[PDB]
Design a protein around this nucleic acid. Structure first.
Ligand SMILES: [Mg+2]
Ligand SMILES: [Mg+2]
Ligand SMILES: [Mg+2]
Ligand SMILES: [Mg+2]
Ligand SMILES: [Mg+2]
Ligand SMILES: [Mg+2]
Ligand SMILES: [Mg+2]
Ligand SMILES: [Mg+2]
Ligand SMILES: [Mg+2]
Ligand SMILES: [Mg+2]
Ligand SMILES: [Mg+2]
Ligand SMILES: [Mg+2]
Ligand SMILES: [Mg+2]
Ligand SMILES: [Mg+2]
Ligand SMILES: [Mg+2]
Ligand SMILES: [Mg+2]
Ligand SMILES: [Mg+2]
Ligand SMILES: [Mg+2]
Ligand SMILES: [Mg+2]
Ligand SMILES: [Mg+2]
Ligand SMILES: [Mg+2]
Ligand SMILES: [Mg+2]
Ligand SMILES: [Mg+2]
Ligand SMILES: [Mg+2]
Ligand SMILES: [Mg+2]
Ligand SMILES: [Mg+2]
Ligand SMILES: [Mg+2]
Ligand SMILES: [Mg+2]
Ligand SMILES: [Mg+2]
Ligand SMILES: [Mg+2]
Ligand SMILES: [Mg+2]
Ligand SMILES: [Mg+2]
Ligand SMILES: [Mg+2]
Lengths: 56, 25, 141, 59, 180
RNA sequence: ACGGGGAAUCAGGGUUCGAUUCCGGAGAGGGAGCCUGAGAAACGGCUACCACAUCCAAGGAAGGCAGCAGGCGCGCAAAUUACCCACUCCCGACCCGGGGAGGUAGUGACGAAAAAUAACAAUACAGGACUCUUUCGAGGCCCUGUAAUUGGAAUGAGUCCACUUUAAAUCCUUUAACGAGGAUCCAUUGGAGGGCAAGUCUGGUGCCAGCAGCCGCGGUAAUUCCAGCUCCAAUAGCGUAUAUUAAAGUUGCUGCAGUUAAAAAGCUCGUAGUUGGAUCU
């Protein structure tokens, strides 16, 4: 078939710049945070266990 | 979640059935 | 039933090897016709010259045009159709240019939609396709 | 801490007889030749091409 | 031919199932509780424990009066008692099968430095060890994964060439004192 | 297909790999024939022929890197035309000379070991547990985090004297001086429907572009494409292609199947093969 449409969608996608952000901790300190986020202080529980990325 | 059971029962065989079943278990 | 006597070792071994010849993978690996017919000649990758850009129809349940290239391997001259993975990536390839081709993922078997295609382009003009796609490198002049 | 080895010789002449040359050079009692391995090897292979006394005429 | 040795080992093994909730949670619990850098340290400790259990299981099937069983079982039990993992009152071979991973993780220099009160956290303990503030007997130890021997435990000090033990101020104190 | 010692994987049994530093064999572009020598059918010895190929004043002469470097070619695929006999040893007439054997550096994400990229205190709190009170409150014990909120402490990555190292050096180790708040001295590679851990959030596209190992996603409300944000897996590493092992009790000795899923010869005889009843203190 025709090869004229070869970069169509990537070409028409509007460009959005990445936001500036703090650096993320690495190594032991990143694993520490995760441990704190998942195991240290989690009191609320309504029988759902919402995922870490529950947008809705 | 009851919402998961509802969304699964609406379309037991659909684009979102596998995810909702995995959530139910 | 199978023989079970203490002196039946030769019968068991001969039967096992004869029946081993009836296994698809074993026969493919040990007969020598598959390696002869393999365009890569048993190599993991190969290098070829782009002959033309071609568009291949996707299989019936889904409609699309898969952008591939006809390449001629340097080491044996065999002609091959190789898939150019990402979008816009066909624009990184020109005619009569060096390309490094690898397998598609299932041991010389066609993958997914694309019919009769078992190779994908890894490098174009000695620069990786991923680097070109992500803007890390530009096409040499 | 540091750990090493030491030798104390009965006399300086005995030390000069028994010590390896580089250790004497560390004390300043010995000097090595200034030629390189390549220089000597090429000189040897050049001398190999000439007969008796002319061997001394190539360097 | 060269004069080199090529004997080397892999100190860990990788789990067969990469994504499963229970294993990931248990490993994360261990990492957070003992201040570990990654899961490779957990798998390393798991591998040493697995090798020890395999040796013990090999020895158990042997005869009780078998001299090989007696010899290597005694050696294994004495090695385990020496590093503090086993109790001297539990010096029978089968008790080796009762050991857990936390027993081996508790004998690290990091956890012992935290337990002795030289540091106020397990992570503070790790940074204290890696910053050459900790010595065992007279040797300054720099490695957090230093399995502390049972006799060596009583000699864990602050490394008298360090600011916390030897009273010599470091870079920051000196610079901030020069500003006065 | 050089053979072994061995290597990868493996419950048990197995399958695969072994050109590769130790032992044995073979060869020095391909064959053949020899001299010397205790020991070669030796090629860093010689004599021919075959194939290549160097210089030539055209009469002639000289060749053999599957040694160390290095070049070409082939390819998916592999390092310096470095220093040294100081160590291990070897050779010689030899305590002395020589050794691209060998050692030392260089290149080196083959692969293996260790191991940074922050720690703490104070605040202020989403805050939580713990605690009395009657709800607030109190609870100032303990923990977590937006903390572009504060604060001093500790450091090595670097720069760099001097030792030490070494044949001479380098590296590592040891020590001066300098060296951290976005501590910008800024971790990546792959993913987020299921298998399989993690968003039917937002914008664009609209069976196109593409993704997708497999099932599938996309035809105007895409949990799957192109991106932003967020999230998770491993982490100084992580994707991809190919060989192979386990998974495979899908080669079945352990341990599979043959009525209908693939499968018992049309039937009988019969050599080799395999197996073969009690019984002897
Ligand atoms: Mg061969
Ligand atoms: Mg073999
Ligand atoms: Mg070999
Ligand atoms: Mg070969
Ligand atoms: Mg050999
Ligand atoms: Mg020979
Ligand atoms: Mg050759
Ligand atoms: Mg010969
Ligand atoms: Mg030669
Ligand atoms: Mg020779
Ligand atoms: Mg060479
Ligand atoms: Mg090339
Ligand atoms: Mg390579
Ligand atoms: Mg020597
Ligand atoms: Mg010598
Ligand atoms: Mg060598
Ligand atoms: Mg260098
Ligand atoms: Mg790699
Ligand atoms: Mg490694
Ligand atoms: Mg350093
Ligand atoms: Mg990412
Ligand atoms: Mg996305
Ligand atoms: Mg998935
Ligand atoms: Mg999931
Ligand atoms: Mg893929
Ligand atoms: Mg998906
Ligand atoms: Mg297999
Ligand atoms: Mg099995
Ligand atoms: Mg079957
Ligand atoms: Mg049938
Ligand atoms: Mg029948
Ligand atoms: Mg018969
Ligand atoms: Mg009988």
């Amino acid at each position: 078939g025709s090869l004229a449409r070869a970069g169509k969608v990537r070409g028409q996608t509007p460009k959005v710049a990445k936001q500036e952000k703090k650096k993320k901790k690495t190594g032991r300190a990143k694993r520490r945070m995760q441990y704190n986020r998942r195991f240290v202080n989690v009191v609320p529980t309504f029988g759902k266990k919402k995922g870490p990325n529950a947008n809705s | 979640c009851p919402e998961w059971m509802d969304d699964f029962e609406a379309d037991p065989k659909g684009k979102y059935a596998q995810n909702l079943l995995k959530k139910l278990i | 039933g199978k023989c079970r006597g203490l002196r039946t070792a030769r019968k068991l071994r001969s039967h096992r090897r004869d029946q081993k010849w009836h296994d698809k993978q074993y026969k493919k690996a040990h007969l020598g016709t598959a390696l002869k017919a393999n365009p890569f000649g048993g190599a993991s990758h190969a290098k070829g010259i782009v002959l033309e850009k071609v568009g291949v129809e996707a299989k019936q349940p889904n409609s699309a045009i898969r952008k591939c290239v006809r390449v001629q391997l340097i080491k044996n001259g065999k002609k091959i159709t190789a898939f150019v993975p990402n979008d816009g990536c066909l624009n990184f390839i020109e005619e009569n240019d060096e390309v490094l081709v690898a397998g598609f993922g299932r041991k010389g078997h066609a993958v997914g939609d694309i019919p009769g295609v078992r190779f994908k382009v890894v490098k174009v003009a000695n620069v990786s396709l991923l680097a070109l796609y992500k803007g890390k490198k530009e096409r040499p002049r | 801490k540091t750990t090493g080895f030491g030798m104390i010789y009965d006399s300086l002449d005995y030390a000069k007889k028994n010590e390896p040359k580089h250790r004497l050079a560390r004390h300043g009692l010995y000097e090595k030749k200034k030629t390189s391995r390549k220089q000597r090897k090429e000189r040897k292979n050049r001398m190999k091409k000439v007969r008796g006394t002319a061997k001394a005429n190539v360097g | 031919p060269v004069a080199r040795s090529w004997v080397c080992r892999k100190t860990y093994v990788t789990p067969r199932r990469p994504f499963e909730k229970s294993r990931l949670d248990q490993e994360l619990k261990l990492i957070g509780e003992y201040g570990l850098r990654n899961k490779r340290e957990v798998w390393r400790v798991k591998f040493t424990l697995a090798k020890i259990r395999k040796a013990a299981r090999e020895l158990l099937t042997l005869d009780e009066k078998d001299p090989r069983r007696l010899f290597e079982g005694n050696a294994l039990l004495r090695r385990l008692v020496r590093i503090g993992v086993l109790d001297e009152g539990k010096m029978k071979l089968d008790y080796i099968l009762g050991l857990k991973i936390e027993d081996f993780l508790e004998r690290r220099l990091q956890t012992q430095v935290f337990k002795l009160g030289l540091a106020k956290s397990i992570h503070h303990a790790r940074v204290l060890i890696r910053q050459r503030h900790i010595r065992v007997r007279k040797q300054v130890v720099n490695i957090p994964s230093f399995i502390v021997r049972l006799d060596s435990q009583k000699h864990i000090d602050f490394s008298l060439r360090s600011p916390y033990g030897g009273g010599r101020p470091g870079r920051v104190k000196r610079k901030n004192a020069k500003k006065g």
